Design a protein around this ligand. Structure first.
Ligand code: NAG
Length: 340
C-alpha cells in the first residue's frame, strides 16, 4: 500500500431518491456513462455497441464502442453479472477510465444482454462495483484496487454522501470522495464497525427496534452496507413482520401505508457497533401526499440475497441519506457520521 496526497470527488445525481449515479469516461477519446457506485458488487460494466437493438434497454442507454477508442485492448472473455434486481451478460474489455480527476487502466464488461425490465427504468447506463476482488466475477481487479495501486490517494478509504431529492436544480445530488471524507457533509464523529470478514462490506447488526420493542433480528444478523441499494432491505420473513408491526399492506414489489398514517409511523433503529442508528418516518416514507384515499410507498422492502453473502439486511440509500458512510479498506471497517 502506497499513499500520496490526492483527494478526488465524484459529483452524483439523485434521481427520485432511488437512483444515485455519477459520470465516468472510457476510451480515447472518452465516451461518458452514468454509473451507480455499488459497494454490493465489484465489477465495472457499461452497455456495448455490440448489444442488439432488440434489447430496447440498449436503444435507451449510452453504448461503449471499442471501434472509436484508440486505447481499447481486446479480451472477449464472457461473463454474467447477477444483481439484486436484474441480470446482465456480455464480455470483458480493457480501456482507460476517468473517475473524478483520476485516470486508470481498468478491465470492465461490455454488456450485450440488458433486459427491458428493469434496465428500461434506469437513468444510469452502467455500474462501478466498489466492492472487493473476492466478489469480482471473472476475478477482475476492481477499479478501487487499481486506483490504490497508483499510490496517489491520501488514504485507502472512500466516502458516500446521498442528499435528499430537491426541486432546485442547483442542489448537489450526492458526492463520492476517493481517498477521504468531506467534513462539509457530516458532523459529530465517525463511529466504526469492523467487517464480519475482508472481501464484503458486511457488518454484524445487533437489533432492529420499531419504536419501543426490539421485535426483529433479536439474536443478531448481517448488514450489507450497499451504496447500490435504493432501500433498506431484509429477508421476506424479517419484512412481512416489520411491516405487520408498522401496519403496512404488502403490494407486489414494495410495502405501502395509507398516506394519512405515514407521518405518525414509528421510529426504526439499527444497532451497529456501539451506537443505535435511528430513522424517523420522514426518513423511510415517500410522503407524496397526506390523503387517506391515496397510498404511500416505504423505502424498505423484501430482498432475499442468496448465500454466501446472504441472507442479510442491506443498508442502502434510505440509510446513507441520514448517515454519511466512509468505507475504510485500510482497517477493514465502515465509519458512520450524521449527514448534513
Ligand atoms: C484476458 O485478461 C486476463 C486477466 O488479466 C488474461 O490473463 C487473459 O489471458 C486475457 N484473455 C485474452 C483472450 O486476452
Amino acid at each position: 500500500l502506497t499513499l500520496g496526497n490526492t483527494t478526488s470527488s465524484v459529483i452524483l445525481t439523485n434521481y427520485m431518491d432511488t437512483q444515485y449515479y455519477g459520470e465516468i469516461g472510457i476510451g480515447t477519446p472518452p465516451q461518458t456513462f452514468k454509473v451507480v457506485f455499488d459497494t454490493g458488487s465489484s465489477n465495472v460494466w457499461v452497455p456495448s455497441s455490440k448489444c442488439s437493438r432488440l434489447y430496447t434497454a440498449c436503444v435507451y442507454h449510452k453504448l461503449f464502442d471499442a471501434s472509436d477508442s484508440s486505447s481499447y485492448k481486446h479480451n472477449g472473455t464472457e461473463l454474467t453479472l447477477r444483481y439484486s434486481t436484474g441480470t446482465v451478460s456480455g464480455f470483458l474489455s480493457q480501456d482507460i477510465i476517468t473517475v473524478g480527476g483520476i485516470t486508470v487502466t481498468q478491465m470492465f464488461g461490455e454488456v450485450t444482454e440488458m433486459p427491458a425490465l428493469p434496465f428500461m427504468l434506469a437513468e444510469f447506463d452502467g455500474v462501478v462495483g466498489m466492492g472487493f476482488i473476492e466478489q469480482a466475477i471473472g476475478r477482475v481487479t476492481p477499479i478501487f484496487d487499481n486506483i490504490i495501486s497508483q499510490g496517489v490517494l491520501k488514504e485507502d478509504v472512500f466516502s458516500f454522501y446521498y442528499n435528499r431529492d430537491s426541486e432546485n436544480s442547483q442542489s448537489l445530488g450526492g458526492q463520492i470522495v476517493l481517498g477521504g471524507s468531506d467534513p462539509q457533509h457530516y458532523e459529530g464523529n465517525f463511529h466504526y464497525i469492523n467487517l464480519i470478514k475482508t472481501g464484503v462490506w458486511q457488518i454484524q447488526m445487533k437489533g432492529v427496534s420499531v419504536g419501543s420493542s426490539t421485535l426483529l433480528c433479536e439474536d443478531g444478523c448481517l448488514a450489507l452496507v450497499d451504496t447500490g441499494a435504493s432501500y433498506i432491505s431484509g429477508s421476506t420473513s424479517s419484512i412481512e413482520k416489520l411491516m405487520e408491526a408498522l401496519g403496512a399492506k404488502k403490494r407486489l414489489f414494495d410495502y405501502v401505508v395509507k398516506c394519512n398514517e405515514g407521518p405518525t409511523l414509528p421510529d426504526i433503529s439499527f444497532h451497529l457497533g456501539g451506537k443505535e442508528y435511528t430513522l424517523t418516518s420522514a426518513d423511510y416514507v415517500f410522503q407524496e401526499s397526506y390523503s387517506s384515499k391515496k397510498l404511500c410507498t416505504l423505502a424498505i422492502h423484501a430482498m432475499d440475497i442468496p448465500p454466501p453473502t446472504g441472507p442479510t439486511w442491506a443498508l442502502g440509500a434510505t440509510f446513507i441519506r441520514k448517515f454519511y458512510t466512509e468505507f475504510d479498506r485500510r482497517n477493514n471497517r465502515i465509519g458512520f457520521a450524521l449527514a448534513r
